[PDB]
Amino acid sequence: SELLVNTKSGKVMGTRVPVLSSHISAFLGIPFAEPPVGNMRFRRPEPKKPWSGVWNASTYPNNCQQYVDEQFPGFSGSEMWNPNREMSEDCLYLNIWVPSPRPKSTTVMVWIYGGGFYSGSSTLDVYNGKYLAYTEEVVLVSLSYRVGAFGFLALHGSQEAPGNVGLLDQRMALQWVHDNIQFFGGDPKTVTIFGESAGGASVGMHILSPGSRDLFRRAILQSGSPNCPWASVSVAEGRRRAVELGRNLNCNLNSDEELIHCLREKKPQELIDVEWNVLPFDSIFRFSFVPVIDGEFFPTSLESMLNSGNFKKTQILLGVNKDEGSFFLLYGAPGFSKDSESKISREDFMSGVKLSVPHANDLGLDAVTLQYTDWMDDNNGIKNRDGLDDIVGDHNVICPLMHFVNKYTKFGNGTYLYFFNHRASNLVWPEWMGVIHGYEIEFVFGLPLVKELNYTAEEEALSRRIMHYWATFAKTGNPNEPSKWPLFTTKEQKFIDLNTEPMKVHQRLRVQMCVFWNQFLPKLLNAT
Amino acid sequence: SELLVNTKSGKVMGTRVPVLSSHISAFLGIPFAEPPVGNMRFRRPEPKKPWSGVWNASTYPNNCQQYVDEQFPGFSGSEMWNPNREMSEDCLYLNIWVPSPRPKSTTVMVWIYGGGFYSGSSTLDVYNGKYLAYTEEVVLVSLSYRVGAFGFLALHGSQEAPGNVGLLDQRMALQWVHDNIQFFGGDPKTVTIFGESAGGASVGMHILSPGSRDLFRRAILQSGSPNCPWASVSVAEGRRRAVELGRNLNCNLNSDEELIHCLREKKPQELIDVEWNVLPFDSIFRFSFVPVIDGEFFPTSLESMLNSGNFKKTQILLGVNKDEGSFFLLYGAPGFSKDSESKISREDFMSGVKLSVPHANDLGLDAVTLQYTDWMDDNNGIKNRDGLDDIVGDHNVICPLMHFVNKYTKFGNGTYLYFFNHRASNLVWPEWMGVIHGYEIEFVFGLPLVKELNYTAEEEALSRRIMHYWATFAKTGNPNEPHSQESKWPLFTTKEQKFIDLNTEPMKVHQRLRVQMCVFWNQFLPKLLNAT
Numbered sequence A: 001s002e003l004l005v006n007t008k009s010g011k012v013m014g015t016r017v018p019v020l021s022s023h024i025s026a027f028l029g030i031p032f033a034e035p036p037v038g039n040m041r042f043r044r045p046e047p048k049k050p051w052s053g054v055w056n057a058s059t060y061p062n063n064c065q066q067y068v069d070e071q072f073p074g075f076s077g078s079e080m081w082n083p084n085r086e087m088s089e090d091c092l093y094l095n096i097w098v099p100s101p102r103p104k105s106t107t108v109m110v111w112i113y114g115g116g117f118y119s120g121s122s123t124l125d126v127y128n129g130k131y132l133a134y135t136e137e138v139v140l141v142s143l144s145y146r147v148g149a150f151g152f153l154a155l156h157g158s159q160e161a162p163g164n165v166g167l168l169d170q171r172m173a174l175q176w177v178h179d180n181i182q183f184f185g186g187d188p189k190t191v192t193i194f195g196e197s198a199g200g201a202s203v204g205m206h207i208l209s210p211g212s213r214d215l216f217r218r219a220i221l222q223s224g225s226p227n228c229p230w231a232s233v234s235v236a237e238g239r240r241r242a243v244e245l246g247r248n249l250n251c252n253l254n255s256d257e258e259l260i261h262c263l264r265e266k267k268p269q270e271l272i273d274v275e276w277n278v279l280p281f282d283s284i285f286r287f288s289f290v291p292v293i294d295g296e297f298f299p300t301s302l303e304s305m306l307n308s309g310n311f312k313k314t315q316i317l318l319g320v321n322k323d324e325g326s327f328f329l330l331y332g333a334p335g336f337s338k339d340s341e342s343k344i345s346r347e348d349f350m351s352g353v354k355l356s357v358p359h360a361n362d363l364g365l366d367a368v369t370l371q372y373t374d375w376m377d378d379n380n381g382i383k384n385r386d387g388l389d390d391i392v393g394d395h396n397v398i399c400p401l402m403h404f405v406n407k408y409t410k411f412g413n414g415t416y417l418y419f420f421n422h423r424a425s426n427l428v429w430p431e432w433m434g435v436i437h438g439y440e441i442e443f444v445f446g447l448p449l450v451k452e453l454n455y456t457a458e459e460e461a462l463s464r465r466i467m468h469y470w471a472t473f474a475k476t477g478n479p480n481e482p483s484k485w486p487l488f489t490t491k492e493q494k495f496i497d498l499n500t501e502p503m504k505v506h507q508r509l510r511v512q513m514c515v516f517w518n519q520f521l522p523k524l525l526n527a528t
Numbered sequence B: 001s002e003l004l005v006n007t008k009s010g011k012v013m014g015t016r017v018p019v020l021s022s023h024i025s026a027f028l029g030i031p032f033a034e035p036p037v038g039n040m041r042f043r044r045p046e047p048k049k050p051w052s053g054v055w056n057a058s059t060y061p062n063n064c065q066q067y068v069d070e071q072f073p074g075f076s077g078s079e080m081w082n083p084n085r086e087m088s089e090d091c092l093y094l095n096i097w098v099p100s101p102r103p104k105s106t107t108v109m110v111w112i113y114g115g116g117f118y119s120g121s122s123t124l125d126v127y128n129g130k131y132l133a134y135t136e137e138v139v140l141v142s143l144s145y146r147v148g149a150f151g152f153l154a155l156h157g158s159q160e161a162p163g164n165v166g167l168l169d170q171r172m173a174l175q176w177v178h179d180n181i182q183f184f185g186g187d188p189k190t191v192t193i194f195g196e197s198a199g200g201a202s203v204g205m206h207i208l209s210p211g212s213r214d215l216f217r218r219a220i221l222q223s224g225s226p227n228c229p230w231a232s233v234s235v236a237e238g239r240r241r242a243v244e245l246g247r248n249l250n251c252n253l254n255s256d257e258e259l260i261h262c263l264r265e266k267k268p269q270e271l272i273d274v275e276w277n278v279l280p281f282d283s284i285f286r287f288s289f290v291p292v293i294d295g296e297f298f299p300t301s302l303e304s305m306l307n308s309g310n311f312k313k314t315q316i317l318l319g320v321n322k323d324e325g326s327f328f329l330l331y332g333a334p335g336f337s338k339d340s341e342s343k344i345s346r347e348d349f350m351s352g353v354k355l356s357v358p359h360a361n362d363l364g365l366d367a368v369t370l371q372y373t374d375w376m377d378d379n380n381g382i383k384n385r386d387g388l389d390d391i392v393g394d395h396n397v398i399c400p401l402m403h404f405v406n407k408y409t410k411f412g413n414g415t416y417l418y419f420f421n422h423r424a425s426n427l428v429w430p431e432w433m434g435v436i437h438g439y440e441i442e443f444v445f446g447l448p449l450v451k452e453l454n455y456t457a458e459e460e461a462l463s464r465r466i467m468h469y470w471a472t473f474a475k476t477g478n479p480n481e482p483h484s485q486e487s488k489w490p491l492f493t494t495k496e497q498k499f500i501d502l503n504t505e506p507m508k509v510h511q512r513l514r515v516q517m518c519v520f521w522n523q524f525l526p527k528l529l530n531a532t
């Protein structure tokens, strides 16, 4: 039968689900690893032990143990990102949507959630795969991975808490797709990994890492790349934070094994309560437990792998939003609110830059401040607010992504670049926040196609053309069916706007600020 | 008789000169110091000792010994700045223009020429003082001072060549005006010193130096201020260039005394032939022999004096031209010519920034480059040309002057700031050069009044209102006439920072002149170089 699929680890039973007057198959909460619980906390994932009889794949799995945002209780714009299922350390499951009737060997897209390596769930209303699966006739998989200490506690040298285990969760999920997706009508030789933020960074990390390269064909990175300043740390800093996590919980610090056993007897949420304490600075867009440059998952530094072309050579499709930084200013920077226009005094601007570039010395801070202050109108609260906004977005997302795209295009086989700047009509966040971090996701996932979601007709046209670009790219390495999204080349450097207006081609996305962040500031910081 | 005047130093006989179908008195080439020749080369000047009989003050004196520009031989554009009289070390003379008939006790303006402290003469056609003095009813003086080595060789510690003597030359001329200008109808209580470029720097230096303060009432600085990067050197760097001047001339370097003795035996042209060789780098807008921060003429660092208010407190009027830099790029940076549009390659842009900011480390160079490059359009020859044009101007003239004006205003009694941005209709330099260093001077001295010079009618009006501002300012401390109906040049205030444009259009008032770049030059870049 259509809903009963036989896989290499045992039988699973999906459920036929309705999509836009019509139906498809959904296989929810399929296990791909053993539950990383008890002794397995912090350890690499192990392949799920095969089961007998029929796994009930009709409802969403548990979400990983994470920090839960409660700045704005009841509020849909903050809550749409929080766990919608019970949280549990037993959380390594994947979900699949297959068009009905089951295609023969079709394009596979694997979704990887963001949330800064400290949160995220595969089960969010915004990641509901039915629309994209139905509309574009693809098999859609959303995986999961451990976040926070559980995913990224790094005590390098240990084999009990090596670090990177969350990236290995993702790799184990891709391995499973490699092994099993053929049984769902998926073509294991035509899988595109894609994800946003910590997920676009994760995608890029699998492009780098020798052990992941063979588990997929192509890649899409939305608003994140592997070289993001927040997306990794050294072995030393990982060890430092992990120790400091032990110290916070009055752990025996005498050795790695005592630290680890101590950290393993704590309740999940005892670890989260102190998670933010291990950071080195008062900071914004900085997360405690993240990937490590370990010599294993990553053979060398990210930079040197980019330069020597030590990475998967394929097509990539990637881009950014217009106001990446506004979510993080609202949450951690003085002067901003959800219920006001958020004009930023000169005083709050300065403390805003220190928060934003927390590794900078005072010369670096002056540099950033000068680069983003209009000195004719320095007391202008709106220019201060927009300037802070651009600092956060240029430094944390846009410029790192541009650095990556320039490095990659030099060795890859097809770059496609977008700048998404459509402000959704039904947005519940205030105008000042602009085109926000994550808000392209709704369109990628087909949500403007659902009538009661109260979107405009041309928002449904835009999401249709995004979905169609995304899946056509997934299928062929080219978002264009043969108006044309051109290749980004190292000479011409073209990208497109993604909004409701007809398509415009531009060149050198934010070159001026990105030379400052990618070339001049690193140089000044290295020198002083 | 108007023409024969008795000064404290001896009698003097002027000459009647025609001006604009009228006439006035001119006393040319009056000595104010002993000829600094022989064992007095490099020495502090000495008062002209009195003479008997009548000094013929009817022709222009000699020009001081200087490098003579010959990049464009016969070209009026460059040649107007060359000495127009025989050069001689015997050159310390002053000129006076006095309205006819002689005023009872009127406003006095003393002109201090520029030319980088290495050149200049009081006798150029562009400094003809007859039109200003005639038109504004002022007593107009032009002084001279020793330039290059002869005026600034600085061997701190020695009293034979202590440095700054060109500036002391200037002081003696002012002391003489103080003493004798009452005899020409001048009021020694109402003298304004004004000059352009090294001239403007000098004026600011007299504002700062305690020994000069009491010799004038008020000051106008044109395209130059004391704290300009090219206007002064440490004693260390001054001594170094002095010793290297010797090394070039094959001199006994065992001691200052032998060094000085050797230098005193060279003919002037020999000193000048090697003048440029003592600079520390390949540069543009750097000059070998300039004032030193010595602890005497300037008590402490110029910066510390500015911050502490250790300066004469008075009114000042000052400003800059739009394209200060173009002259110096033309003469010294790759890719520029006076016969083309001077579109600059990116290669030539980089080597142009190195030449323009020669003291900067590699990181400093990157910052300048980043600050003036449009990275959407980096191979644009027009934008590279203009960026380089702004770099030289912003670093060397405008931002220094802005620093001075902001610091000064904190303590002074009236600031008036201007932006001269009129490109003369009759200009012989190419259009890419724009509003050039020095070209406000012909307007200040009233040359457009003379029909044969073929300026437009609106240029004459511009010259007439510029002269009136300057002299009204000299008269009262404010360029605006009381209870006039004409548009009003507002005070620069530290909160508000207003300035006007100076051109043929009606007056625009603006605020914070070149703030964005001047924050880079005055705050950010100095922090960066001082990190190493």
Ligand SMILES: *[C@@H]1O[C@H](CO)[C@@H](O)[C@H](O)[C@H]1NC(C)=O
Pocket (backbone or CB within 6 Å): A056, A058, A059
């Ligand atoms: C699977 O689980 C759901 C709800 O937890 C239940 O309604 C459904 O019947 C289950 N399937 C079977 C056949 O056990």
Ligand SMILES: *[C@@H]1O[C@H](CO)[C@@H](O)[C@H](O)[C@H]1NC(C)=O
Pocket (backbone or CB within 6 Å): A412, A413, A414
């Ligand atoms: C991709 O690779 C093939 C051969 O290896 C080459 O012919 C093709 O042009 C490449 N495409 C791009 C756009 O790099």
Ligand SMILES: *[C@@H]1O[C@H](CO)[C@@H](O)[C@H](O)[C@H]1NC(C)=O
Pocket (backbone or CB within 6 Å): B056, B058, B059
């Ligand atoms: C002064 O010199 C000039 C020019 O040579 C001459 O016209 C004038 O008569 C001279 N005066 C006297 C009295 O010698």
Ligand SMILES: *[C@@H]1O[C@H](CO)[C@@H](O)[C@H](O)[C@H]1NC(C)=O
Pocket (backbone or CB within 6 Å): B412, B413, B414
């Ligand atoms: C100049 O000084 C006088 C008295 O000391 C003062 O009243 C006047 O306001 C000052 N003018 C300015 C513009 O600073």
